[PDB]
Amino acid sequence: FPRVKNWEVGSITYDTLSAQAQQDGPCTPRRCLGSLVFPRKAPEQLLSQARDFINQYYSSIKRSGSQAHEQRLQEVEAEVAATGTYQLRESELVFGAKQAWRNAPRCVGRIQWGKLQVFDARDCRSAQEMFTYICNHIKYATNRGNLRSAITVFPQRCPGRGDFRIWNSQLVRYAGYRQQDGSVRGDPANVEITELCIQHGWTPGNGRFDVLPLLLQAPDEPPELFLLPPELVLEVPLEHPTLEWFAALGLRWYALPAVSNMLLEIGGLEFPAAPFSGWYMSTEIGTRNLCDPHRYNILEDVAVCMDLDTRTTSSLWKDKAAVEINVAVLHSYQLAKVTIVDHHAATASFMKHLENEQKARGGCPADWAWIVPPISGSLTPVFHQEMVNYFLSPAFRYQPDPW
Amino acid sequence: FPRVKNWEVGSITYDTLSAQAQQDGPCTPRRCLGSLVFPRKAPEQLLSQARDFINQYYSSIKRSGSQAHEQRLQEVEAEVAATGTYQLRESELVFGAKQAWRNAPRCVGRIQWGKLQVFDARDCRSAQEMFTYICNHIKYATNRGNLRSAITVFPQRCPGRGDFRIWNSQLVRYAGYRQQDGSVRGDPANVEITELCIQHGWTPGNGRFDVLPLLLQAPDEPPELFLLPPELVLEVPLEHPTLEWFAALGLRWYALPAVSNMLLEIGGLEFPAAPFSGWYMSTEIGTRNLCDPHRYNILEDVAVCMDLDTRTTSSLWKDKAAVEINVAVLHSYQLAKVTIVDHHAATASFMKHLENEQKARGGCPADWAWIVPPISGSLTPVFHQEMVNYFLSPAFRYQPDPW
Ligand code: HEM
Ligand code: HEM
Ligand SMILES: N=C(Nc1ccc(CCNCc2cccc(NC(=N)c3cncs3)c2)cc1)c1cncs1
Ligand SMILES: N=C(Nc1ccc(CCNCc2cccc(NC(=N)c3cncs3)c2)cc1)c1cncs1
Ligand SMILES: C[C@H](O)[C@H](O)[C@H]1CNc2nc(N)[nH]c(=O)c2N1
Ligand SMILES: C[C@H](O)[C@H](O)[C@H]1CNc2nc(N)[nH]c(=O)c2N1
Ligand SMILES: [Ca+2]
Ligand SMILES: [Ca+2]
Ligand SMILES: [Cl-]
Numbered sequence: 001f002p003r004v005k006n007w008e009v010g011s012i013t014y015d016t017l018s019a020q021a022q023q024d025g026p027c028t029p030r031r032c033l034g035s036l037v038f039p040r041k042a043p044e045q046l047l048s049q050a051r052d053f054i055n056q057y058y059s060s061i062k063r064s065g066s067q068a069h070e071q072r073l074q075e076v077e078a079e080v081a082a083t084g085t086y087q088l089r090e091s092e093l094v095f096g097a098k099q100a101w102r103n104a105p106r107c108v109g110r111i112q113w114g115k116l117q118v119f120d121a122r123d124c125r126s127a128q129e130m131f132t133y134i135c136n137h138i139k140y141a142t143n144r145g146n147l148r149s150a151i152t153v154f155p156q157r158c159p160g161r162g163d164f165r166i167w168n169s170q171l172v173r174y175a176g177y178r179q180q181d182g183s184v185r186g187d188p189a190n191v192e193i194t195e196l197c198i199q200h201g202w203t204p205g206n207g208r209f210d211v212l213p214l215l216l217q218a219p220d221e222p223p224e225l226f227l228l229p230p231e232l233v234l235e236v237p238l239e240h241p242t243l244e245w246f247a248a249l250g251l252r253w254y255a256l257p258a259v260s261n262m263l264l265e266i267g268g269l270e271f272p273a274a275p276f277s278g279w280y281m282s283t284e285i286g287t288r289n290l291c292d293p294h295r296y297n298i299l300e301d302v303a304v305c306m307d308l309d310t311r312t313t314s315s316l317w318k319d320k321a322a323v324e325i326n327v328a329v330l331h332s333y334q335l336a337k338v339t340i341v342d343h344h345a346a347t348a349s350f351m352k353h354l355e356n357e358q359k360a361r362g363g364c365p366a367d368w369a370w371i372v373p374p375i376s377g378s379l380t381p382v383f384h385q386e387m388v389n390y391f392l393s394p395a396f397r398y399q400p401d402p403w
Numbered sequence: 404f405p406r407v408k409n410w411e412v413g414s415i416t417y418d419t420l421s422a423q424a425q426q427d428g429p430c431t432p433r434r435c436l437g438s439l440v441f442p443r444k445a446p447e448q449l450l451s452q453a454r455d456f457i458n459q460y461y462s463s464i465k466r467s468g469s470q471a472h473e474q475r476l477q478e479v480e481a482e483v484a485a486t487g488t489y490q491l492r493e494s495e496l497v498f499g500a501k502q503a504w505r506n507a508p509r510c511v512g513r514i515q516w517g518k519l520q521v522f523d524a525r526d527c528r529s530a531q532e533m534f535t536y537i538c539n540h541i542k543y544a545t546n547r548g549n550l551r552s553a554i555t556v557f558p559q560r561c562p563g564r565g566d567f568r569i570w571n572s573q574l575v576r577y578a579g580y581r582q583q584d585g586s587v588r589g590d591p592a593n594v595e596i597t598e599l600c601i602q603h604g605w606t607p608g609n610g611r612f613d614v615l616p617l618l619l620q621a622p623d624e625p626p627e628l629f630l631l632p633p634e635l636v637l638e639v640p641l642e643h644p645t646l647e648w649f650a651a652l653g654l655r656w657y658a659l660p661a662v663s664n665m666l667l668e669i670g671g672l673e674f675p676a677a678p679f680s681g682w683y684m685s686t687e688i689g690t691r692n693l694c695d696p697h698r699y700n701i702l703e704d705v706a707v708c709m710d711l712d713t714r715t716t717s718s719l720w721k722d723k724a725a726v727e728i729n730v731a732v733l734h735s736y737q738l739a740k741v742t743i744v745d746h747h748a749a750t751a752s753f754m755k756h757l758e759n760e761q762k763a764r765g766g767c768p769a770d771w772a773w774i775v776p777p778i779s780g781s782l783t784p785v786f787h788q789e790m791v792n793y794f795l796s797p798a799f800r801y802q803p804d805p806w
């Protein structure tokens with residue numbers, strides 16, 4: 001059991017849950033690979049994961065080993081012998097979706113993990129039904145700006161059948177257009193999906209903030225291109241409380257972060273289409289999406305407008321510009337009554353989550369590199385907290401792109 | 404070999420040097436412990452370490468497999484067989500100290516690793532001569548503000564005789580006076596060594612920036628107290644370029660960071676006293692030392708004087724105050740003409756180092772959590788660089804406090 005210390009307070013805890021880690025991460029005693037974004041890369045096997053998820057579920061509701069427990073087990077045995085897969089009960093699916101959030105080591109927002117709206121789309125067929133399940137997700141989750149966590153679970157993977165996939169990495173993304181001068185107009189992260197929407201017959205725009213269509217894929221069919229109703233996509237134009245020229249930069253961002261390209265794994269079952277959404281932490285927008293050199297890369301533009309000395313690094317013009325962009329994000333979302341959390345509040349809440357989980361299950365998988373915010377690292381309490389990273393199931397996992 | 408990606412550029416390398424990692428770290432495939440501050444804690448083993456180190460030395464001078472190379476291997480073999488230990492040649496000690504720096508995964512300053520002044524103190528015989536070696540180090544390294552990197556190597560550990568030790572964690576450190584109610588006047592990080600100085604006869608001040616004496620330990624002797632000559636301890640009064648009241652906070656910091664409590668390991672030999680010094684990166688002073696809640700903890704005081712809304716996190720008052728403190732540190736050192744580097748220049752030079760080392764050795768041991776600075780993380784290039792962490796020798800190691 002690894003000993004983990006908080007260096008600001010001096011307290012000591014032991015992570016006993018890590019002993020239960022299901023799958024293997026990339027690290028070995030010879031070398032640590034914790035900084036890598038991708039830690040890389042049947043029926044008797046499926047049953048072993050299915051059984052242990054069922055034992056988890058019944059333990060969580062006290063029905064440990066009771067009458068319903070053994071019958072659920074024998075039910076799954078027969079289903080897999082008959083079909084090669086099995087179906088989850090609706091409560092097992094809700095439980096599994098929440099635990100997979102709960103287990104996500106890179107999520108700072110997990111204090112909220114017990115509050116998630118699960119929409120069961122497992123009866124889905126055709127891309128037009130996908131699109132309708134999706135549009136209902138967006139409307140429920142946006143809630144006119146009072147954002148609410150939700151996940152929509154499309155049908156699981158099963159043998160011989162194609163897959164339900166959402167090709168977009170998020171439900172709301174801005175286009176990125178390659179151009180003759182080499183660079184990109186819009187979001188460079190989305191250059192690949194933007195030329196795929198264009199390939200599949202989408203006439204493009206020419207703005208830096210053109211909302212992309214959806215490329216939805218039903219099993220064993222090409223993807224179909226749907227346009228989101230513009231009144232369903234809530235956006236926040238960015239202004240600054242005191243810098244009147246900030247608004248003239250024409251920056252904006254969207255209200256709803258809805259990740260649509262990860263795979264949900266519950267009890268050996270795999271759901272390659274299960275978009276989930278919550279709300280944003282301010283640094284995600286104002287530091288990473290707007291100030292990453294390979295994203296909108298606006299930081300020098302703001303610094304020029306602030307009349308900072310951009311010819312020496314030691315003036316900290318980069319630091320001052322980033323702070324005001326983050327201020328603009330917080331101010332604009334609050335003025336628009338869209339849910340947003342600043343990085344100080346979020347990390348403080350994650351510390352409370354760590355304490356809750358220490359008592360609930362003896363530890364908490366956490367990825368320090370991703371929990372610590374991308375600005376003001378050591379000004380937040382998570383910087384001073386040692387963390388243990390490991391993989392538990394149910395889980396959210398990366399998956400190959402469909403194409 | 405592990406594949407390593409830079410996400411700003413897209414470039415990919417493979418760290419083939421990690422396959423040579425001798426000593427094991429704390430991670431397993433089950434769980435990564437990369438965020439822990441302390442990752443750890445006879446003839447034929449000594450020989451294999453000595454042989455490896457000699458091989459390194461002769462590769463470094465492009466004379467591998469030469470007559471000199473084979474003869475030095477045999478010579479080390481004969482001395483170990485006769486005495487159980489051996490002595491480094493002078494040239495080997497210089498090379499080994501530079502390689503220990505080169506190998507230190509938590510150091511962002513390693514672009515400089517070849518420029519290191521190595522003072523050989525292995526004939527030192529008393530605490531009094533120890534103090535003279537230390538004063539000569541400080542005088543050379545300080546160089547009236549034009550800082551020069553240096554290390555002084557005291558005698559190696561050997562059987563049947565105590566170690567040389569410097570009890571202080573750095574050669575220059577401010578007193579921390581622990582108060583009855585748990586508060587501290589001075590630097591809270593130095594409360595232990597402050598109480599040991601007093602217990603060993605030092606008459607304490609009552610300031611916040613009182614320079615501590617040195618407790619110097621010769622073999623098999625209690626530590627002895629030595630006062631540093633005030634004229635050898637260069638200090639920088641802190642002022643801000645545009646906030647004139649900042650000067651009235653009465654803050655100061657010292658010019659020379661000189662770590663004195665780590666163990667230097669070279670070719671299986673151990674040097675428990677081997678102080679080394681370079682110059683500061685400004686975030687060490689302005690962010691960690693002055694703004695850590697468990698250090699000087701000045702953030703709220705500064706934010707109040709700047710008239711910031713400290714009642715709500717979403718004002719980003721902490722971020723704004725931390726930036727101006729960091730500006731004051733850089734401005735103040737530049738005004739005093741004392742060497743300092745800001746976190747942007749330092750991290751840019753570290754990216755150059757990684758490219759150099761990829762060519763030279765096929766990889767570079769790097770601790771992401773320590774290389775990324777404590778403010779403005781994703782605004783520096785190292786945030787977006789995947790890193791592999793591992794232990795090479797020669798090495799600087801932690802060791803228990805001698806009391
Ligand atoms: C309720 C508000 C939420 C906030 C403020 C929040 C915050 C965050 C942040 C800042 C990250 C780091 C993402 C990045 O830097 O790219 C993250 C990661 C993650 N979150 Fe949360 N999150 C929330 C809700 C949710 C929900 C509802 C789920 C799923 C049910 C979830 C699952 C995940 C996963 C799987 C990751 C890791 C993604 C990856 O590894 O790429 N989060 N979260
Ligand atoms: C020349 C300018 C240098 C700069 C700007 C620099 C910078 C740094 C910084 C910022 C750290 C992190 C320290 C902390 O957070 O406590 C570090 C760690 C370290 N530095 Fe450097 N350094 C320099 C020179 C040197 C030299 C000359 C040596 C040894 C000969 C050295 C050896 C180390 C080691 C071993 C560590 C790891 C300390 C630990 O693990 O606690 N550095 N350095
Ligand atoms: N895509 C590539 N790299 C890449 C890899 C990983 C990433 C990180 C993507 N995380 C997006 C994300 C995930 C989780 C939470 C949020 N934020 C939230 N607050 C919420 C979202 N939902 C409910 S809350 C955002 C980005 C890019 C490529 C590599 N090669 C060609 S493309
Ligand atoms: N305090 C404890 N732990 C503790 C453990 C580790 C640490 C980290 C200590 N880094 C000090 C340091 C190291 C390397 C470089 C610099 N900076 C420079 N620029 C240079 C210095 N030389 C040439 S360049 C500063 C600090 C505290 C305790 C344990 N038990 C009771 S207290
Ligand atoms: C190389 C490194 O793992 C990569 O840049 C990580 C670091 N930490 C992160 N932290 C968050 N929150 N989001 C990220 O995308 C990343 N990227
Ligand atoms: C818990 C965590 O490892 C600890 O706070 C580390 C994080 N990164 C660091 N990085 C540097 N450069 N110096 C430090 O002291 C630390 N502290
Ligand atoms: Ca100007
Ligand atoms: Ca000899
Ligand atoms: Cl995003």
Ligand SMILES: [Cl-]
Nearest residue numbers: 660687688692
């Ligand atoms: Cl220091």
Ligand SMILES: [Gd]
Nearest residue numbers: 304305306307
């Ligand atoms: Gd102007």
Ligand SMILES: [Gd]
Nearest residue numbers: 644645646647
């Ligand atoms: Gd002024």
Ligand SMILES: [Zn+2]
Nearest residue numbers: 027032430435
């Ligand atoms: Zn690891």
